[PDB]
Structure formats: C-alpha cells, structure tokens
C-alpha cells in the first residue's frame, strides 16, 4: 500500500541525477575547497546553487557529484563508527522509586545530576560550578547499576551505557578513536548522560616493567582524560565512572578535578534493611500480620543482592514444603537457606573489597 504513493513522486527522484553523490571529507577552505575522497583522491570544488557559504566547515563530510564534482548537501561528521549507535538505550525499566532506603546514596546523586538538568537556574544565583563527574563504586551486589538507570528515567533524555571492555578493540590505537565517539555526541546531543561500567579493566598506571603488553590499555585513560579535561576545558554533560575495584584504579583517576561528588555504597543497617523488604512487600504475597523487621534482623549484614533473594526463594517453598503463600515459617527456613545455606564459598558480599 505505501509503495504506490511513493512511486508517483519517484519520477524526479530516480530518473534525474541528484542522489548519486560521492561523499568525502573537506580539508582546506579558501574564501577553492580541497577535499579527499574515500579512494584517496584530492580535488578542488566550490559552493553550489542552494549551498550556503557558512554551512561548509573544516573536517566535515560533504557529498559531491561523481561526474562533475560540486558541493550539493552537507552531512554530519563522524559517519564511520557504527558502534555507538547501539550504545544509546531508551526508557529503562527501572524507575526512580525502585531504589529502596532513605539513606544518603539517593539524594546526593540527584542534586549533582538531576538538579542542574531540571533547574539550571537554581545554582546560577550563587554563581557556582556544578560537579562534572561523580564517583560510584561500592561493594559488589548492592545494585549500583540499578541506581544509574533510575537517574535516566527522571532525566527523560539520551542515556549512554559504556562497558569497560568495549573501549578496548582488536587493533592498537583504535581504542583512542572509541573515546572521541562518546564525547562527539555530547556536543551534538546536549543534556545527555554517559555511564562507564567496569573501569578497572581500563584504568590504572601499571607502569612499564610488567608483562609489556599493558601499554595499550593505559593509553585509553590518557585519551579519556584528555577528552574529559584537556588543554581546552570542553565539556557539557555528566560523566559517571563505576567499577567494583576502586583500589586498582589510577591514583590520578582517584583524585578530584575530573570528579567532585564521591559516594560509596554501604550495607544497610537494621533500619536500612527493613525498607529493602518493604519495597518488595508490595509485590509477591505477604501474609497479614508478619513483621519484616525480625527477618532482616536475623539476617546478618549483606549486600542487596542477597536481600532480594529472601523474597524470591520464599515463593519456592510454596511447592515442596506444602504451603499456599509465603508464611512466617517459610521465612525462618529461608534464613538457614538463603543466607546460612548459601554462604559456603564463592559468596562475595564484603569478601573482596580490594583485589
């Protein structure tokens, strides 16, 4: 059906020669334009009929006709990378209210990120500088990645999630181009959010005398630091560094001036772990008259990953243990099962804080 309407206007856009343009990047601007093709061929051209003199800029892809080369339409630069097109997500499922607890790991993030985006004129009265970067590391298993998605929901803008292993490519030097791919969209798309995940595989000095193949990774941060704070302080959006190993990072990366707000996650206390089961109490099945403060009290200090496992495994006892819904008896069985039974080995929580 839609193909019939497009065939009517397809007479001028097909038979005539317009679209068959050869796209290439412009080099020198004389106000004669020296442009190098993809086949490595240099030539000279000039403006067109409807082409504006202010549209042509240095280092921009400009399509020209293949027969007689002339400028026709400008194109946005950096057309080669296809990787960063899939790095932008849309509408994350985790909401802002999914993060439990009244502690300080919530309010501190929204003031340095969501506050300048929603109300940029609030800090303009005092004439201060909002923090460009932030710091979130914490112990493994607290759902730190869930807090990054909760910010993207309230922001209602472009979000970029970057994996630490994605920056390292299969060639030496290609990782340097991967850094500018992220910061190029910062100027193109204003008021977005970039997020780095597992930076420990990237950062750190690591010096020289080691295995010797380590000099390729250390240049990624030196390219990332240069693109963050260089000779020219070029930056707009907020930068988020996150990993599970803060001690193995670059001691320069661990110092301010690229980062101001620093928040480290901690294990919720008896009052903190209570709200963890309250946000899950609205879900599943909760028997009327059951106090969740006694369950979190019998459970020792542990990450939120093992806290949500209590409510999930409690529903598993409805089959083998011959129960309708989750009762208080099944909650006590989960204490020796979800916690005491699963300790053994290979249980992280606070086990690995360093290496």
């Amino acid at each position: 059906a839609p193909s019939h309407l497009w065939d009517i206007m397809g007479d001028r856009q097909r038979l005539g020669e317009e679209h068959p343009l050869q796209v290439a990047r412009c080099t020198k601007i004389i106000k004669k334009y020296v442009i190098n093709l993809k086949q490595i061929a240099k030539f000279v051209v000039g403006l067109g009929e409807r082409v504006s003199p202010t549209d042509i800029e240095e280092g921009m892809r400009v399509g020209v006709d293949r027969s007689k080369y002339n400028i026709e339409l400008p194109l946005p630069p950096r057309i080669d990378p296809s990787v960063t097109m899939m790095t932008v997500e849309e509408k994350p499922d985790v909401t802002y209210s999914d993060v439990g607890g009244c502690k300080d790991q919530i309010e501190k993030l929204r003031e340095v990120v969501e506050l300048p985006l929603l109300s940029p004129e609030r800090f303009a009265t005092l004439g201060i500088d909002p923090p460009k970067g932030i710091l979130l590391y914490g112990p493994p298993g607290t759902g730190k990645t869930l807090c990054a998605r909760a910010v993207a929901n309230r922001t209602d803008a472009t979000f970029i999630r970057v994996i630490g292993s994605e920056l390292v490519q299969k060639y030496v030097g290609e990782g340097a181009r991967m850094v500018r791919e992220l910061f190029e969209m910062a100027r193109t798309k204003k008021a977005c959010i970039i997020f780095f995940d597992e930076i420990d595989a990237v950062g750190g000095a690591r010096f020289d005398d080691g295995a010797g193949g380590d000099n390729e990774v250390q240049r990624t941060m030196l390219e990332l630091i240069t693109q963050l704070d260089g000779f020219d302080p070029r930056g707009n959006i907020k930068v988020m560094f996150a990993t599970n190993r803060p001690n193995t990072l670059d001691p320069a990366l661990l110092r301010p001036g690229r980062i101001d707000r620093k928040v480290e996650f901690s294990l919720p206390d008896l009052e903190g772990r209570a709200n963890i089961f309250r946000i899950h109490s609205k879900s599943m099945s909760v028997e009327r008259g059951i106090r969740w403060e006694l369950i979190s009290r019998l459970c020792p200090n542990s990450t939120g990953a093992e806290l949500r496992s209590v409510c999930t495994e409690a529903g598993m006892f409805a089959i083998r243990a011959r129960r309708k819904v989750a009762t208080e008896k099944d909650f006590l069985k989960a204490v020796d099962k979800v916690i005491s039974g699963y300790k053994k080995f290979s249980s992280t929580s606070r086990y690995m804080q360093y290496n």
Partner: protein
C-alpha cells in the same frame, strides 16, 4: 634537455607534461601537490601556500 615537469596523480598514475607558462621552475619543486587537469593533465594552479594538509586534527583556536 629543455624545461619539463613530471607529476603523479593521487590515483597512482604518472603523466608527463611540458612546461606550462602558468608555473615557474623557481616555484616548482619535487614532492608537491598542485592542481592538474582531468583531460589534458596540465597544471593550471600552483601550490596554495600549504605543504600537504592538517591530516587528522588541528587546533584553530586563537
């Protein structure tokens, strides 16, 4: 011997051309990028005061 100039296109094609009045042997020099004709392969343009180019990136800030 006479006056002659040998050039090579960016397509890797070596074309011989006689000395053109638009250029002088003092301004000419080997390993130089100058404009040439597509049909007659004659140099109609001298060097525009730049050796090669800025290649990848350059800082234009004043």
């Amino acid at each position: 011997v006479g006056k002659a100039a040998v050039v090579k296109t960016s397509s890797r094609q070596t074309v011989f051309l006689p000395m053109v009045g638009l250029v002088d042997p003092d301004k000419l020099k080997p390993n130089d990028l100058v404009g040439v004709n597509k049909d007659s392969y004659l140099i109609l343009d001298t060097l525009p005061s730049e050796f090669d180019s800025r290649v990848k990136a350059m800082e234009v800030d004043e």
